[PDB]
Amino acid sequence: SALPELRELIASFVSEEPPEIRRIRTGTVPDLPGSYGQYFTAWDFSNSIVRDYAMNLYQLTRLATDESVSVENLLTVFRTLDPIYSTFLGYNGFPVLAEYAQRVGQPAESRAELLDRLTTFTEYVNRLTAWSHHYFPWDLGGERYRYAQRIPVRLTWQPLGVQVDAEIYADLNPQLATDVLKALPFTVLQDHAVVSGESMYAWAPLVSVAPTPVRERICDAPVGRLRFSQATGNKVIVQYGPTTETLSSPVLGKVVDSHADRLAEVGKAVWESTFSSKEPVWLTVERL
Ligand X SMILES: N[C@@H](Cc1c[nH]c2ccccc12)C(=O)O
Question: Considering only residues 11, 140, 194, 288, which one is a binding residue for ligand X as defined by CB under 6 A?
Answer: 194
> Hey, is 61 helix, strand or coil?
helix
Nearest distance from C-beta of residue 107 to ligand X, angstroms:
25
Decide if residue 84 touches ligand X (CB under 6 A). yes
- Mark the segment that binds ligand X (CB under 6 A) among 17-25, 111-119, 189-197, 204-212: 189-197
Question: Considering only residues 193, 223, 252, 281, which one is a binding residue for ligand X as defined by CB under 6 A?
Answer: 193
β-strands 235-243, 248-255: how paired? unpaired
Report the alpha-carbon distance of residue 33 to residue 88 in Å, rounded: 11
Report the alpha-carbon distance of residue 114 to residue 138 in Å, rounded: 36
Q: Residue 88 or 157: which CB sits closer to ligand X?
A: 88
Query: What single-letter amino acid sits at 116?
Result: D
Of residues 32 through 61, those in contact with ligand X by CB under 6 A are 49
Nearest distance from C-beta of residue 132 to ligand X, angstroms:
12
Report the alpha-carbon distance of residue 53 to residue 232 in Å, rounded: 10
* Binding interface with a copy of itself (CB under 8 A): 27, 31-45, 48-49, 52-53, 55-56, 59-60, 62-63, 66, 68-70, 72-73, 76-77, 80-81, 84-85, 87-88, 91-92, 137-138, 140-142, 144-147, 192-198, 231-232, 244-247, 271, 275
C-beta separation of 14 from 187 below 8 A:
yes
Partner whose binding site includes residue 65, from a copy of itself, ligand X, none (CB under 5 to 8 Å by kind): none
> Hey, is 265 helix, strand or coil?
helix
Report the alpha-carbon distance of residue 200 to residue 55 in Å, rounded: 19
Nearest distance from C-beta of residue 249 to ligand X, angstroms:
8
Report the alpha-carbon distance of residue 196 to residue 104 in Å, rounded: 33
CB within 8 Å of 205: residues ≥ 6 apart:
10, 14, 123, 127, 183, 186, 188
Report the alpha-carbon distance of residue 136 to residue 125 in Å, rounded: 16
Nearest distance from C-beta of residue 14 to a copy of itself, angstroms:
24
Partner whose binding site includes residue 163, from a copy of itself, ligand X, none (CB under 5 to 8 Å by kind): none
Report the alpha-carbon distance of residue 129 to residue 45 in Å, rounded: 12
Question: Considering only residues 116, 245, 265, 272, which one is a binding residue for ligand X as defined by CB under 6 A?
Answer: 245
Report how many residues bind ligand X under the rule CB under 6 A. 10
Nearest distance from C-beta of residue 88 to ligand X, angstroms:
4
Q: Is the peptide bond before 159 cis (omega within 30 degrees of 0)?
A: yes
Q: Residue 108 or 131: which CB sits closer to ligand X?
A: 131
Q: Residue 114 or 151: which CB sits closer to a copy of itself?
A: 114
Q: Output the CA angle 58-266-222, nearest 5 degrees.
A: 70
Q: Residue 196 or 212: which CB sits closer to ligand X?
A: 196
β-strands 282-287, 191-192: how paired? unpaired
Q: Residue 187 or 229: which CB sits closer to ligand X?
A: 229
Contact mark string toward ligand X, 217..236, x via CB under 6 A: ---------------x----
DSSP bridge pairs for 236: 202, 228
Which residues of the chain form contacts with ligand X (CB under 6 A)?
A: 49, 84, 88, 193-196, 232, 245, 247
